[PDB]
Amino acid sequence: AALVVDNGSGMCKAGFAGDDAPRAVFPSIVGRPRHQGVMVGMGQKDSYVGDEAQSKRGILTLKYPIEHGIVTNWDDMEKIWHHTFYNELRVAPEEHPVLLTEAPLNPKANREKMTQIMFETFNTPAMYVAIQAVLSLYASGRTTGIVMDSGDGVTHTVPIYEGYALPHAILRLDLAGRDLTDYLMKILTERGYSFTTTAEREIVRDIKEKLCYVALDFEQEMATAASSSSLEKSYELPDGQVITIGNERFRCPEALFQPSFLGMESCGIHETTFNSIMKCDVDIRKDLYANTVLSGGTTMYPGIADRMQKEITALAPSTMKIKIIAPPERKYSVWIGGSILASLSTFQQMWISKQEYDESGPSIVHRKCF
Amino acid sequence: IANQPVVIDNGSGVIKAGFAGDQIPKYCFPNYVGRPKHVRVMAGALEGDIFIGPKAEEHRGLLSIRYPMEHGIVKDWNDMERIWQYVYSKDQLQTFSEEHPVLLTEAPLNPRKNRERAAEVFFETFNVPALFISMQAVLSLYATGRTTGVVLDSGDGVTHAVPIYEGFAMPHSIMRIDIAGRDVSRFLRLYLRKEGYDFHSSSEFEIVKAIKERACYLSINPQKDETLETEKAQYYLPDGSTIEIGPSRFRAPELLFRPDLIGEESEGIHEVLVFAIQKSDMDLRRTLFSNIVLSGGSTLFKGFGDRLLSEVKKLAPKDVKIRISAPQERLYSTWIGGSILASLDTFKKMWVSKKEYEEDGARSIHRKTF
Amino acid sequence: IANQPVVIDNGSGVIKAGFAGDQIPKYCFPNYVGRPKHVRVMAGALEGDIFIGPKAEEHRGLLSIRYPMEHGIVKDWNDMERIWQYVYSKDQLQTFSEEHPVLLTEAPLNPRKNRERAAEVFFETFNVPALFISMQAVLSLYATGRTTGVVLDSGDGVTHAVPIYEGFAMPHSIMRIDIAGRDVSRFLRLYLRKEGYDFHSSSEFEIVKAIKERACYLSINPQKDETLETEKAQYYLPDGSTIEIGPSRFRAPELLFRPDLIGEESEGIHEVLVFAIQKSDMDLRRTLFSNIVLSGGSTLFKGFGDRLLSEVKKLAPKDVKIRISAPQERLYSTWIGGSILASLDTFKKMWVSKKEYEEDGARSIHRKTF
Amino acid sequence: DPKYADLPGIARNEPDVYETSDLPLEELTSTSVEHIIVNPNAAYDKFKDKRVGTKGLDFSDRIGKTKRTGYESGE
């Protein structure tokens, strides 16, 4: 009996260890109302969380507590974890030990303060923080190979060979789902359809998930988009109003492969995956090309795998065979790994206990992280 | 054609026209179409069903005001064509549009359909030699005569902050919010009804804009002025009747700096300025704080510069020099910039010829913009 | 030749240029090509798409930095051509390349293709009378005015140790390691992200280099200073914001002494020096240990001399006299050596003439360099 | 001044500028290392009359004809 709780910037995936898929999946947001001095009606919650805030988007100002895999407002994150254990999962945190997930190369204060809350506020019996990328490999039953776990908050590239990780080869890029969502708003505003508010940004994320797809040749796709209106698809908003996004459909996910569009002055998700493999030892490169995994929900774009293969193959040597690993459950790839890890009898020892926390302090986490 | 170019500012509130030779705009009239309020069947009433600028101001109470441009976007194009036709009337300028070339001043990050249709009208309806769409912010710097400078241009329709350093505008650091002078006029009408004076009519909305422009001071501390008993300064209406404004005077334009009070999800005028600087690169931040320029009519509020300086200082880093350099001609700054730009021999290269638009296509106007 | 020969110390971090005989290099500017990343909209902005040296330093925030040479190997030659062109331009020495002979200063044990292309550019693109390529270490000994000494030259790009006894330099005892000042700045950036301050931008990476030079001390005992709670010393960024560096201050420069931290299987700067002496013949070991000369900018770290003297003493034999001598101008020591060598009449015989290069080709340069 | 006197919607009796109040090697002094003063004029004189023999010079990785030592002798 143990709890796996993925603390993703976009969506918080929580559930019991051993189960196939996560029990409760809700958007990680806190909804505070745009209140005036006028008195409010009955059935009023001071701050709404998750699926409740997703229902009452109209009035509530949606504030994401985790920004680029860094917890900015801890009071907000506490209210999400309270919604996770007590309401969503229907379980006491004192009974079950809780596994959390942190992105690699995050600030040290993040891991420090995270565990402090779990030990003091919720009074958990044991707490282990893990790298999202390390878990994602277990999903595919692969010990060897690199992963390109692109989330809503961040995208990170962690090469692991024969159950041994290369820490110095790890590269983090701040370009992620929320930056693409923010980019899609700007180009939709250029077409005509203006989306400004926090509630409207959530509707633009629903537009992104459904329509947007990765093009094989961007320049070739822009030529077909100009000539014919075949790529132009219609989407119905919450309001009866319908919109035809056009070429901006395949223009949004292009930002992943060339950040110049967003204006970050950084390497693309294809180029960073190559650079990470080159930073590793020369011998093991072979297996990393052969076992390139794509994880998170930012790798569920239709035809990212095809475009990824093409771009890596061009950069990589001709003799090498480049196979991209795209399992059907990419969105729940971080959690399903956690469920496999927590269930294993070997992992029982690796848990950090309250007694261990009390004596040493919150600094113990940095030793027993990975 | 060598004959003098005609600058025209597309201000949502007030459109400012004139020749490039003039130091100031000779002809500047309100941007609204005036039709008779009662649907005219009979003779001896207001004939034509069109009253623009000074003719409208004379017979204002009889007519019904309808603004053609909202939030820096043209809603009714038929109305805007009549307005631009009145610019080339016997009343203002008194010239052929076919002879003189034109310069438009569209707000930043507007819809591309707005720019394309604006060009189509000025090339097809009027037989213009050449047209050039420009950004309102870039012009404001030419007027003042400095290359580096952030331009907080608070218009009637839209308030936007564009950072430009050494003649280089960062397009990602641009910030645009719809809460502008027109919204302040709308919110003042609500507070005037809370004082007990209704301005229900579209004509009666114009005198609320006059009340705002005459008497509305921005308090340095809003909470202290609320507790203090007001003088209740009397304003005289067109009919002759007096109205005591009282606390509505100062707590109306406050909604610029704090738009959450009414319940509008926006950043605020102090916030968009700071955010635009913070979004730009770290090296430039100090110079961009050291060079801020106020543009448009919604900066002329009494004690605006006093409040903004205080509200920017607390958000901005400690011990940083913040100079908010307002010109004396803030309202007419955007046009004077265009008048200087138009006069230069470089402008001859920048504009798009009528034959160029026929051959090249639609993109011609967009690609030459920058 | 009557015209003085120009000394150019082609350093990875800073390229130092000047005329032979001069006591100090008159014109020393940072080695990078700055291109504007933001768009030009206004007229009168900064002219050119290439900014090099002091103009690039002033307008750093506007530009995207790109180092042409990495680890003493010219990666992009087009860029290296533009910086050498800028040395001869009006801003620096302001003379024709055809009238003055050149003295280039490359690192030891660099690729042969680098020396070949370096010559090809300096003879074809610039029609120079004569070029002599020399080692950095050999010059550093002429500056101090000593025939016997080992030269530990820790530069920005590469750190190397060359044992030289009574004029002769032992080519098999030369020790070179890629880990250097620029890897310390790269390793500092990684630890600053762990502390929770991000510097993703190429312009922001120059601020990390500024933080390194100002606030980073090498602790005499590494394991001792790790355990003890450190005073969190605040540093003021260009914008004004304060960062607490904390443990990253002293952990960052330790990379030079322990290359295992970044994860490269190479010798430490302390191991490089002793290995270079131990590789030399038995008789000269005592004289080389007595005569140690530190060079390059990366030796200027606070407590480098104290730590190195501690580390060398443990690896070196018992009861041997270890005197580490520092010239006050460590950074400019390499160039001053070049000026003294260039001023001697013996340098005339050492040169490769244009006709000599044109006849034999690449071989002539390889024959006469060390 | 007379230009802005003509226009109606102009700021009168207002300050133009709203501004804030105007606010007004450790290794090179180490014991371990021995600090030498670089005098190139002195150095130049010591090496002044020293020559090198560039006849039969070959520093390159050429195997032919045993070992070589570049810069034979002076004068």
Ligand SMILES: Nc1ncnc2c1ncn2[C@@H]1O[C@H](COP(=O)(O)OP(=O)(O)OP(=O)(O)O)[C@@H](O)[C@H]1O
């Ligand atoms: N099918 C899809 N196609 C395209 N984009 C998607 C799709 N599903 C989700 N996204 C986008 O990618 C993000 C995926 O978030 P996800 O559910 O993987 O959680 P997360 O916060 O990224 O967690 P983690 O970092 O642990 O992977 C969403 O926020 C959304 O913006």
Ligand SMILES: Nc1ncnc2c1ncn2[C@@H]1O[C@H](COP(=O)(O)OP(=O)(O)O)[C@@H](O)[C@H]1O
């Ligand atoms: N003297 C003034 N005091 C206060 N508000 C003013 C004043 N003059 C104009 N305004 C406000 O500013 C608006 C004018 O905006 P304007 O500068 O013409 O915008 P644009 O830059 O788009 O042309 C008016 O409609 C009014 O709301």
Ligand SMILES: Nc1ncnc2c1ncn2[C@@H]1O[C@H](COP(=O)(O)OP(=O)(O)O)[C@@H](O)[C@H]1O
């Ligand atoms: N005061 C300082 N403290 C620490 N490191 C420094 C200091 N000054 C310069 N450096 C480092 O030394 C570098 C300069 O290298 P330099 O000696 O000019 O190279 P080269 O010897 O290859 O010509 C800088 O880029 C920086 O990384």
